[PDB]
RNA sequence: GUAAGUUUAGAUUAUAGCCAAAAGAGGGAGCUCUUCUGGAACGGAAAAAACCUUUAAUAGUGAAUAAUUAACAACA
RNA sequence: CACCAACUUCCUAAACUUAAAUUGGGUUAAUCUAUAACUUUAUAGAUGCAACACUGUUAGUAUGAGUAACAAGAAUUCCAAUUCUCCAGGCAUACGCGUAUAACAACUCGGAUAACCAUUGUUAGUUAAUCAGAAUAGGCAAUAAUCACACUAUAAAUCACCUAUAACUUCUCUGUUAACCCAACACCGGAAUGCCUAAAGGAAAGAUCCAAAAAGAUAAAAGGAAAAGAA
RNA sequence: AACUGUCUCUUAUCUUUAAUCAGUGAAAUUGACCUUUCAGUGAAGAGGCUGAAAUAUAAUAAUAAGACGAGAAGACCCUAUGGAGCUUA
């Protein structure tokens, strides 16, 4: 077993220089051994990605999986520790950066039928890792005008170089 | 039938990943001004629903006790009456319940 | 487990090829690093040019005031190079100019300060020092060695040749070293050039010739979202000078910087400059 | 396959759904507020509302009293109805039983929940919803195209 | 024209093709056999073990060539 | 009136001539020992010394697939609470099992989900003079039962008591719990006797939708093989 | 003979399944696959070769006729100057 994501919290950097911009906050929150699937965690985490801190936690409220239940609880924890622990001025500041969930140690049985017939079963167990970075979440993208493809297309034709020419 | 080979985790992660397949997100969250708590549009608040719900079982704990007995339904009129809450002439001929805690602010 | 120790030594050794992958070590400065000597590289240094230097002024015009200043931080817990720096760039600027001059004498005195400010920029005249390794024999007090720092070093170098081999060797080594950092280099890219068609005119009359009439004289998909224009500038009815582009502003003023070149004689066949000469 | 269906499928049966109906009923006049699930809820509110009005209809009625009795497991309510109920709901013609949307049950299940509860009951009010006032800048703004109009 | 050959002593392994093309014999188509000859592209015949051009294999941003699925109604 | 096209050939630098069992010769990875070397090397001597392949052996992790699959009567004032709706083999003993019993505390594992425990930990338990289990030697025997009387029958169907000898004042031990057993499982299976048939014993509904298709059940205008009658 | 949805000639309702939410969660299988159509070629034979053609990416829901479908030591009869075993008069 492995255990970096918390060795993450305990990364010291070093002091910061009078020529140096205030450092954002990184907060690395994680459950290791949860009895949910990492396949269906996983569409949880994806969603919630990029996402504030305030609109995941609406969200998970008003939600009927048990895993977002796990993950408001594991929402929660982090943002305690962050505001006691990494000197987070205001709550509302933060946006969930990262969110994925991993595989844990799980226990084997066998599964009995009825008929004479036997079956593999498994305990499954899960880990769930986030990154909280202090602030709103980053703008969204803007897509590509017609404009902006047509300009470097005509680019990317100047850019061509002759190939196999003296 | 069997399945003819292993499907790859890159077309297995496109079927799992694919939009139809992901979680969406609700916009029809509300805030409750009675308990300052999230709510849905076309949901209730339940923080204040708490207290609603748990007078009622107060209240209808005090009916119980006062009954007796089953089948004691009144053919009467019931009213509920909170400490500092004195009977009316209209309160007459009508079963009354008393009520120890005082008339609460949002029971009118 | 797997018994034995080579093979455990030879997992260390892969082990340490990761590390230094992932985690490059922070540049340090082949004089602190070990097996270093400056005598040594320093003659080598003058034998690899086949140029005499001396190497009490070789050494000076390497020493730097930043240089200095660590040596005294260091005593309290010697001459510079400005010298010698004064000197070589003041005679490369005169050099310099020299050679654009006879080449191009139709050239204009602004045209060759261009030229001359692009040859000894700190960017041209840091790579040429690093390429040569005149960082390493660079003394300064931070590494990597700063740009001007390093600069005042090449120039106070070139002072320092001037005593030890005289000016006919110094000026051999700037047109075998910097003047050949011009090849394949156009005139508008070392010299910045706006309002050509202006200035064409303005040559133009100093010479008493008649302003050109544009004209176009070829076109291709005007309509087009890819349209090339061929303008020719005509005087007293006699095409001079043609450019290609995508617009009739775009050709002319391609042409306008056609005709600029063959005005100074910048054409693309003209005759190349010649390092052959040993005189 | 549900187009143009006016009942819905409840219990093991039709006359399980009337037993089902037939309880929730009952509960609903001796407490007068049940919580049920939408569903059922939505089923059954016609049905409370039509038995105000065989309570309206009159005691002396053998109809009602047979409706009544049918309907109503526990007969001390048999009373209550024609004294009680019957007598609150005079003044109205209708909308006697309110039905409101409760939260989803957190059982695992996420079942639809609703409240069904007698208008005029001398229970706690229940959290109803309160329209904007008028005071707000759009109904303000409108409140000025009033006054010109 | 060309460089192997005979004898003596010791010693095993191989001893089953395929297809094309010739000469026969059964036969009367085609087959069934016996005998002689040739073959095993990275080129060509469309893809093509068996046919055709091809002596081995080396780097080069050279050159001359081989075989090479195409062909140009009748009456005195 | 030709060009293109093969390492055929020439050209610069080189090279020195065309398949696979078998046969001759030259090297080498790794480990240990001898003797050296000292960031992992040399010369010798040794060997459990080299695997993309035996439906190989062991372990791990995928794929099928989050697919097959599985689940609790209602309301309330509340799970050893009331009431309502409906179902109809229950209680003792034998046998077997052996603490699954009961209280408390836990919420991880076990129940194929929860609630709740049947799980985890700790503490407690089943009371018997009546219920159940744990001397000798002689003498002498014709005739069933069946309400046993009549009455028949055939399959042919019950120690005692006398005569002597010997002993001479007794209530301890063990069994007693349970929703329990045999079937790998909390298996729609198997499981003796006595009493009784609801006073005893129980719950088909995890939620929503009402797809198609499929299965089961009910209903049929006219007709009746396109009722229970005969051979 | 009657009887009836067996059929002429099907239809309607209810339960199961089905579909949706949530919890838990197998099996056979699997060289790798960025997994198309027509004609050719071939051993009856082509998603992968030859020549044409078609072709945003990714998904979602349905049906089982054919490929004289794929399969086993299934079924039947007969042979042997085949074996081996057994019995002898
Ligand atoms: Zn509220």
Redesign the interface.
Known sequence: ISRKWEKKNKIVYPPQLPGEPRRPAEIYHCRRQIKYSK?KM???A??IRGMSIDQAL??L??N?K?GAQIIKEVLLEAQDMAVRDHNVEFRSNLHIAESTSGRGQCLKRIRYHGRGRFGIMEKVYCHYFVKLVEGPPPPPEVPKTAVDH?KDY?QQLRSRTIIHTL | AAPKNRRTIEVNRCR??NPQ??????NN?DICPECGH?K?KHVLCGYCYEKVRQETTKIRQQIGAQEGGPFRAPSVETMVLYTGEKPSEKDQGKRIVERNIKRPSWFT | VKKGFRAAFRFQKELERWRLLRCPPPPVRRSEKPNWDYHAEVQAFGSRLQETFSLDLLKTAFINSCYIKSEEAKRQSLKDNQELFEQGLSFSHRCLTQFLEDEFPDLPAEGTESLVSFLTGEAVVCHVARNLAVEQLTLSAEFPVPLPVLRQTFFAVIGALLQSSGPERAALFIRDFLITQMTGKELFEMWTVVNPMGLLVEELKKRNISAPESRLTRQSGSTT??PLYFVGLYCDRKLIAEGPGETVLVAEEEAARVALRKLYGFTENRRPWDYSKPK | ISHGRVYRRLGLGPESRIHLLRNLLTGLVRHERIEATWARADEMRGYAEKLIDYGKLGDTNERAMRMADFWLTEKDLIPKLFKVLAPRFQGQNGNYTRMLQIPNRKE?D?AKMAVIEYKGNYLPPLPLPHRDSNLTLLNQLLLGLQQDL
């Open positions: 396949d996983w569409y949880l994806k969603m609406a969200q409220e008003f009927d048990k047509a005509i | 799992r990943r397949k992901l979680i969406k997100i609700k969250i999230l849905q | 979202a890819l | 695992q996420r």
